[PDB]
Subunit: 121 residues, 4 copies
């Protein structure tokens, strides 16, 4: 799925995920969020299963974005964890964890959880 994954993907929020999949399992690219304390592109990296099961199963993958770039710093990181499902309407179906840096006293409220679905259109 190196070919399948590589490219430009869009989620339900209107965010844009630009990724390259390496033959060795790497994911590199940029993320631009349509929401939150974010502007322009941010580095991302991740990993995917470069030899998935041949049985109909999706391809596991994940990636991280730390919310610092030359424009802003939102003192946070999101990780998406999910699977790529190939075919006529290819999708990446993810769940994510967004942890902000907090004091000890606020750690209980440090982590948001949600779900993003990415499509090629």
């Amino acid at each position: 799925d190196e070919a399948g994954i590589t490219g430009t993907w869009y989620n339900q929020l209107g965010s844009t995920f630009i990724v390259t999949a390496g033959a060795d399992g790497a994911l590199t690219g940029t993320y631009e969020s349509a929401v939150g304390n974010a502007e322009s592109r941010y580095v991302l990296t991740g990993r995917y299963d470069s030899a998935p099961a041949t049985d109909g199963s999706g391809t596991a993958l994940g990636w991280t974005v730390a919310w610092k770039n030359n424009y802003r710093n939102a003192h946070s990181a999101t990780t998406w964890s999910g699977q790529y499902v190939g075919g006529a309407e290819a999708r990446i179906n993810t769940q994510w964890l967004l942890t902000s840096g907090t004091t000890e006293a606020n750690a209980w409220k440090s982590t948001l959880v949600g779900h993003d679905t990415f499509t090629k259109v």
Copy 2:
């Protein structure tokens, strides 16, 4: 916290996380899990906030492991999302999402969620 983060960390399961923090926000290294469908080391990559708040707050970070290496392939990926808290007993406090590749019919049961706390000892 490039110095703070860089090195060998151990969680409550007895897993070993070996990371280098780059000046530019990169995280690279290897993960070896004490549990699950896993043996030996697996590549990991991630990101962290290289200019955290100076107010007492932790440092946001995350990383991914796809569960494929030369020994096995568990057709899955974990993402940890959390924060580094520096000082006498430094910690990385994380929550994680483990997504397995599944068919459409099994997607509902694709994703495990838990929490790992990493220490230097």
Copy 3:
């Protein structure tokens, strides 16, 4: 939203959630899952915000199902946490945690996480 919430709801898996909302914040009813180790109806209970904000915001709510009834026992419980959004196409948008009873050694893999969207049709 006592009137709004009360009734029969269906999710994207084809599961059926039958609830009564009490004036005092109670949720009582039955759940029947279309997937998993489940058959027929199972008791559920929960709570919702009986005096929500008047600003356009959704109405917070949650409920639990333990997966035991007269037919089976799957030694697990799901909690859904989410919000009711009223209007022409009313929805309940949830995220859920399914914890199985496990030994200590398997606790790391005890908890599934997903997301369900319920509609009146």
Copy 4:
């Protein structure tokens, strides 16, 4: 575990959970949080597996709190999902989802996720 569960439990934040376990799987009680937009006690309800496995496994359970009482309304609900582990130092080990009522535009940031461990002392 009706006897095991029933009573007063305390988490790592200093919150107090007072529960009765019914023979039929019910959980009823009150929760008082040490943190957040909360004061005094709030109703809770939930469910647990009243006939757990005899193999060493924990007992699955969950409960909800909507954050409305006579003192305040934080327009939110938490669900804890977890397991009771009996014996010399009994514990309830949970993960939780806290959903706030939000507008559509803020739904992405509606849900916090964390983990609480409850003890009898």
